[PDB]
RNA sequence: CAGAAGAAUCAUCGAAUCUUUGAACGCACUGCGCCUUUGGGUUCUACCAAAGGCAUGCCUGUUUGAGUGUCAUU
RNA sequence: GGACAUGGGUUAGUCGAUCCUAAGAGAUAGGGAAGCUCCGUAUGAAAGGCACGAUUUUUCGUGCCUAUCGAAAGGG
RNA sequence: GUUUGGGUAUAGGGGCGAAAGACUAAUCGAACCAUCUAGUAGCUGGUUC
RNA sequence: AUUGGAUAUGCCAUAUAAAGCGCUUUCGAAGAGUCGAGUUGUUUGCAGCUCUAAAUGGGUGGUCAUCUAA
RNA sequence: UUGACCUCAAAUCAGGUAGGACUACGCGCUGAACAAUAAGCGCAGGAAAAGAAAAUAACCAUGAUUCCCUCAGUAACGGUGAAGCGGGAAAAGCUCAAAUUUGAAAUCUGGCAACAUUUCUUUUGUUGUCCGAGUUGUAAUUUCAA
């Protein structure tokens, strides 16, 4: 009915038809592989999270939840340490073990020294022993970078292992 | 730094130093064009607190507008029309006399690589910032159109909202 | 005609639940099924329940 | 001007799909961040408890969470709110502590140059 | 008629002599149409016109591929050899510079990136 | 209808072509110019044709300037 | 039928236009105006040329002078 | 028994006031177009088995 | 065919680097013809005009609270 | 004499960029007769604008913006007509100016040159080198939550 719509109604050039709209089709899971393998595409994300053992939200839900079956003092707690939480389902247990084995693999955070760092701290050690990190810091000739005692420690431990 | 001194000195606008300079510069600016390019900001301290950097792609333009809309708002819109390839960043009063108020407008070239590659000013290259001064999105434009946070500062009242289940 | 004509009607959730309860009870009455127009003249029993 | 509501069921569905799209991306972590428990500001509602914006800097410090790592693990920060009573502090410190106990944080791949 | 692949298997001056020959043949056929021709000649007019178009197409693409070769890895190339998506897309920030960050923001995402986590029910 | 025999008034579409205009851009609105290169002819200091260029404002850089603007130069 | 259909028909170095200017209009310089835009036409505009020279520390010195539109009846 | 063709420029109400100025207008007197507008009806005409 | 964010793995990695936390017998800058006042327009906000600041100052609410503009 | 610099010009100088259209929704300006209306003028995007408090409140306090519901036809103002609270949707935070890098402008455009890369011979970079920009201040660092 527009001039621009009447233009292509009387045209011979076909309409740029695209077929993309299919309602009720929920977004497929990328991201986590373990969640993807255990996600059933029919269910809702609240149903999927609860089945997997995960919380969709850590806050209250703003409405009634579905019922399918007929269901059968600062200091003490500010100092207490909550003793983790149980892994109800297999998927949660799988995620927990995967995280722990990954953390164990990526656990050796300590680095060796380079050629310059080793020679730097070795020369400082050969004069002031291995305990007087305060005196090594105040040494102006050998500690030309003006490293403090805490950094001269971090070099010494990194050289040991 | 000397910018603290320039900012304290700009507060004494009628002292002997500032009143004398105002006379000589107002005379100088009137000899030039109504809108002329400024080789450098007259108030470098004021320009840089408004976003100006002494790097390629930043442009200062001087304009005089007649006293008696806001004159600062008029200054930005006329300068923005004069340099239509730039983006009006901000503007500041530099001088005035009986007839004229004088402003320096800060503009940025969005096609320059020194601007397109600077993460602190990339936003102005994005096409939502074409003619911020024409839509009231500059500092003076926001203040003129009442935008502000507080209690001091239509359609949801002229519309009748009829819901399905009513 | 205007699009803001009233199309949807409110019914109290209690009356809807009343009518649905009345509809199920009527479904268990063989004579109402015949008046409805159902050919249940050879159905073994009303209500007709089949295994899982 | 008359505002109609014929897109109300459509708006409902579109918001559900946005939650589904969000979950499609961030699959294991929750779709919502954890909000604090605050008391509404008036004599008519101060007996209730509702959800706040974020956890205060004093609340995070008592819970052991730095303000930099809080956003990473989904704990919002409210730099404007403050704890005028220890009840607000204890209420939300334990909210953080419970959240941490139920949290599984997946390690990250880090860069490790060959030399020192 | 004229096949495009065997046309592309020839040199530019050979394609020019073929084009000159076809233009002569087209001119003769249009002369036959004014003097009174047969359906075969009138049908031959359209084929000759398409054959001229194919030869011109092959000549033009060979010319443009030579220009693309000459300007390959050059800072500035002819406007007709540049991309033509839209005027707005050409003015947009490139994915590179749209992703430029300050060292301040680089340090933030290096040390405190968004973590992967989950909440146990 | 005639005619033709990887066909097609087919589809898709990532390569091209895309006259005169129009924000419309050498200047005017049948025209009138300038600059660069090349070519033709049965005629070559002439004539002709072809191709590629020549709007405005502003930005960055480049080059060349101007100033009884501010100075330095035993 | 000045209708309908089918075809044909207007040939220029010398005839007109093309070129020039007229009253006037008008862009530019500048200045107004919130602004669509207005005033302004040599206006406080750096308003564009020509010659000279054994080549000048192979980095140019010296001298001189200083829009457009508008007429198929005007001028040519 | 000086008109005119083509091209052109342009001031344009009324009283006040010696003039200047004002006090409201104007685009002159108006015309036409489109919107506002479905302006203002204690009224006229009609209002269906 | 073209892409997206992850995963595993290879190579490279300028780390003599860069961060968070935690300590203080050391410091801690904060936007002006703007705020404001007077007055005239539009509708407390904003605009013009004249005048024109301050530094626990200034804004806003109720000595206190709260906030930190240009 | 020679040369620095400042300011201001010129070039069909190298490379860019602006206009016009559409205009439902969006942001400014202007604005009547009978309405932050229509008309007029300016400028955008896929959304725009707004936005991380010179914000509320007077509580056991809240905590960027936006939107919906409510507050509420209430308070106020004299028919006009809110807002805080409350419930929800969505959520994310931040960058500068003001600091001596001063044991070292650590910063960046452009030319040329290689080398890669591509929705792409059409895109986008990297490395080197040179001329410039820049100390009348470009990086790093800090933004009051500190």
Curated annotation (Swiss-Prot), chain A:
Residue span of region Disordered: 1-23
Sorted UniProt keywords: Nucleus, Ribonucleoprotein, Ribosome biogenesis, rRNA processing
Presence of the UniProt keyword Phosphoprotein in the record: no
Cellular compartments annotated: Nucleus, Nucleolus
First-listed, main subcellular location of the protein, grouped into a coarse class: nucleus
Annotated InterPro entries: Ribosome_biogenesis_Nop16
Gene Ontology CC entries for this record: nucleolus; nucleus; preribosome; preribosome, large subunit precursor
Gene Ontology biological process: assembly of large subunit precursor of preribosome; ribosomal large subunit biogenesis; rRNA processing
Function, in words: Involved in the biogenesis of the 60S ribosomal subunit.
Record's subunit section: Component of the pre-66S ribosomal particle.
Similarity-based family: Belongs to the NOP16 family.
Protein's UniProt name: Nucleolar protein 16
Gene responsible for this protein: nop16
Swiss-Prot record, chain B:
Cell location: Cytoplasm; Nucleus; Nucleus, Nucleolus
Entry's Gene Ontology molecular function annotations: RNA binding; structural constituent of ribosome
Region of interest called Disordered, as start-end residue ranges on this chain: 134-153
PROSITE patterns on file: RIBOSOMAL_L15E
The keyword Magnesium appears for this protein: no
Keyword entries, A-Z: Cytoplasm, Nucleus, Ribonucleoprotein, Ribosomal protein
One GO CC term, this protein: nucleolus
UniProt-listed SMART domains: Ribosomal_L15e
Biased composition (Basic residues): 142-152
Any one biological process term the GO annotation gives: cytoplasmic translation
Protein function: Component of the ribosome, a large ribonucleoprotein complex responsible for the synthesis of proteins in the cell. The small ribosomal subunit (SSU) binds messenger RNAs (mRNAs) and translates the encoded message by selecting cognate aminoacyl-transfer RNA (tRNA) molecules. The large subunit (LSU) contains the ribosomal catalytic site termed the peptidyl transferase center (PTC), which catalyzes the formation of peptide bonds, thereby polymerizing the amino acids delivered by tRNAs into a polypeptide chain.
Subunit field text: Component of the large ribosomal subunit (LSU). Mature yeast ribosomes consist of a small (40S) and a large (60S) subunit. The 40S small subunit contains 1 molecule of ribosomal RNA (18S rRNA) and at least 33 different proteins. The large 60S subunit contains 3 rRNA molecules (25S, 5.8S and 5S rRNA) and at least 46 different proteins.
UniProt family annotation: Belongs to the eukaryotic ribosomal protein eL15 family.
Misc remark: There are 2 genes for eL15 in S.pombe.
The protein, known as: Large ribosomal subunit protein eL15A
Swiss-Prot record, chain C:
Subunit structure: Component of the large ribosomal subunit (LSU). Mature yeast ribosomes consist of a small (40S) and a large (60S) subunit. The 40S small subunit contains 1 molecule of ribosomal RNA (18S rRNA) and at least 33 different proteins. The large 60S subunit contains 3 rRNA molecules (25S, 5.8S and 5S rRNA) and at least 46 different proteins. uL4 is associated with the polypeptide exit tunnel. uL4 interacts with its chaperone ACL4 and the nuclear import receptor KAP104.
Localization of this protein: Cytoplasm
UniProt name for this protein: Large ribosomal subunit protein uL4B
Extra remark beyond the main annotation: There are 2 genes for uL4 in S.pombe.
Role description: Component of the ribosome, a large ribonucleoprotein complex responsible for the synthesis of proteins in the cell. The small ribosomal subunit (SSU) binds messenger RNAs (mRNAs) and translates the encoded message by selecting cognate aminoacyl-transfer RNA (tRNA) molecules. The large subunit (LSU) contains the ribosomal catalytic site termed the peptidyl transferase center (PTC), which catalyzes the formation of peptide bonds, thereby polymerizing the amino acids delivered by tRNAs into a polypeptide chain.
Family: Belongs to the universal ribosomal protein uL4 family.
Annotated transmembrane regions: none
Swiss-Prot record, chain D:
Source superkingdom: Eukaryota
Any one GO BP annotation for this protein: cytoplasmic translation
Protein task: Component of the ribosome, a large ribonucleoprotein complex responsible for the synthesis of proteins in the cell. The small ribosomal subunit (SSU) binds messenger RNAs (mRNAs) and translates the encoded message by selecting cognate aminoacyl-transfer RNA (tRNA) molecules. The large subunit (LSU) contains the ribosomal catalytic site termed the peptidyl transferase center (PTC), which catalyzes the formation of peptide bonds, thereby polymerizing the amino acids delivered by tRNAs into a polypeptide chain.
UniProt keywords, alphabetically: Cytoplasm, Phosphoprotein, Ribonucleoprotein, Ribosomal protein
Gene that encodes the chain: rpl13
Name of the protein in its database record: Large ribosomal subunit protein eL13
Coiled-coil segments on the chain, per record: none
Keyword Isomerase among UniProt keywords: no
One GO MF term attached to the UniProt entry: RNA binding
CC per GO annotation: cytosol; cytosolic large ribosomal subunit; preribosome
Record family assignment: Belongs to the eukaryotic ribosomal protein eL13 family.
Protein's UniProt keywords contain Cell wall biogenesis/degradation: no
Quaternary structure annotation from Swiss-Prot or TrEMBL: Component of the large ribosomal subunit (LSU). Mature yeast ribosomes consist of a small (40S) and a large (60S) subunit. The 40S small subunit contains 1 molecule of ribosomal RNA (18S rRNA) and at least 33 different proteins. The large 60S subunit contains 3 rRNA molecules (25S, 5.8S and 5S rRNA) and at least 46 different proteins.
Subcellular location: Cytoplasm
Protein source organism: Schizosaccharomyces pombe (strain 972 / ATCC 24843) (Fission yeast)
């Amino acid at each position: 009915a527009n001039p621009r719509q009447r233009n292509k109604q009387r045209s011979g050039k076909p309409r740029l038809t695209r077929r993309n709209a299919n309602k009720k089709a929920k977004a497929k899971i990328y991201g986590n592989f373990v969640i993807q393998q255990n996600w059933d595409k029919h269910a809702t994300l609240r149903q999927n999270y609860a089945r997997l053992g995960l919380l969709a939200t850590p806050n209250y839900v703003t409405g009634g939840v579905e019922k399918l079956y007929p269901d059968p003092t600062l200091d003490d707690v500010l100092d207490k340490e909550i003793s983790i939480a149980p892994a109800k389902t297999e998927v949660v247990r799988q995620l927990e073990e995967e995280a722990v084995k990954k953390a164990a693999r990526q656990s050796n955070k300590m680095l060796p020294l380079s050629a310059f760092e080793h020679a730097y701290i070795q020369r400082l050690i050969n004069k002031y022993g291995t305990e007087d990190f305060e005196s090594m810091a105040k040494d102006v000739k050998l500690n030309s970078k003006l490293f403090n005692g805490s950094k001269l420690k971090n070099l010494y431990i990194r050289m040991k292992a | 730094g000397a910018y603290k001194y320039l900012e304290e000195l700009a507060k004494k606008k009628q002292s002997d130093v500032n009143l004398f300079l105002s006379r000589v510069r107002a005379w100088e600016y009137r000899q030039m064009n109504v809108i002329h390019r400024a080789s450098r900001p007259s108030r470098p301290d004021k320009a840089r607190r408004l976003g100006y950097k002494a790097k390629q792609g930043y442009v200062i333009y001087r304009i005089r507008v007649r006293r008696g809309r806001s004159a600062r708002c008029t200054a930005e819109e006329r300068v923005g029309r004069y340099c239509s390839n730039l983006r009006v960043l901000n503007s500041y009063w530099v001088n005035q006399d009986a007839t004229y108020k004088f402003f320096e407008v800060i503009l940025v070239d969005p096609s320059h690589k020194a601007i397109r590659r600077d993460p602190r000013i990339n936003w102005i290259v994005n096409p939502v910032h074409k003619h911020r001064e024409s839509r009231g999105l500059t500092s003076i434009g926001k203040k003129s159109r009442g935008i502000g946070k507080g209690h001091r500062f239509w359609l949801r009242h002229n519309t009748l909202s009829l819901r399905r289940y009513r | 005609t205007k699009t803001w004509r009233k199309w949807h009607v409110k019914v109290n959730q209690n009356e809807k639940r009343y009518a649905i309860a009345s509809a199920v009870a009527a479904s268990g009455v063989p004579s109402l099924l015949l008046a409805r127009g159902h050919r249940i003249e050879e159905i073994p029993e009303v209500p007709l329940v089949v295994d899982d | 001007y008359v505002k109609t509501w014929f897109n109300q069921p459509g708006r409902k569905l579109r918001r559900r799909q946005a939650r589904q799209t969000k979950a499609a991306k961030i699959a294991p972590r929750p779709v919502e961040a954890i909000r604090p428990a605050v008391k509404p500001p008036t004599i008519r509602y101060n007996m209730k408890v509702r959800a706040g914006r974020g956890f205060t800097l004093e609340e995070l410090k008592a819970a052991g969470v730095s303000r930099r790592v809080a956003s990473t693990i989904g704990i919002p920060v409210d730099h404007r709110r403050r704890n005028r009573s220890e009840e607000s502090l204890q209420r939300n410190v334990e909210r953080i502590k419970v959240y941490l106990a139920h949290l599984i944080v997946f390690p990250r791949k880090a860069g490790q140059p060959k030399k020192g | 008629a004229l096949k495009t692949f065997e046309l592309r298997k020839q040199s530019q001056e050979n394609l020019a002599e073929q084009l000159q020959e076809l233009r002569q043949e087209l001119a003769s056929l249009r002369v036959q149409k004014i003097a009174g021709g047969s359906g075969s000649k009138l049908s031959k007019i359209k084929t000759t016109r398409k054959d001229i178009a194919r030869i011109l197409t092959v000549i033009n693409e060979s010319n443009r591929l030579a220009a693309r070769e000459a300007y390959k890895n050059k800072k500035y190339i002819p406007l007709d050899l540049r991309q033509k998506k839209t005027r707005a897309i050409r003015r947009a920030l490139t994915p590179y510079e749209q992703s430029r960050k300050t060292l301040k923001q680089i340090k933030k995402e290096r040390y405190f990136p968004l973590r992967k986590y989950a909440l146990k029910a």
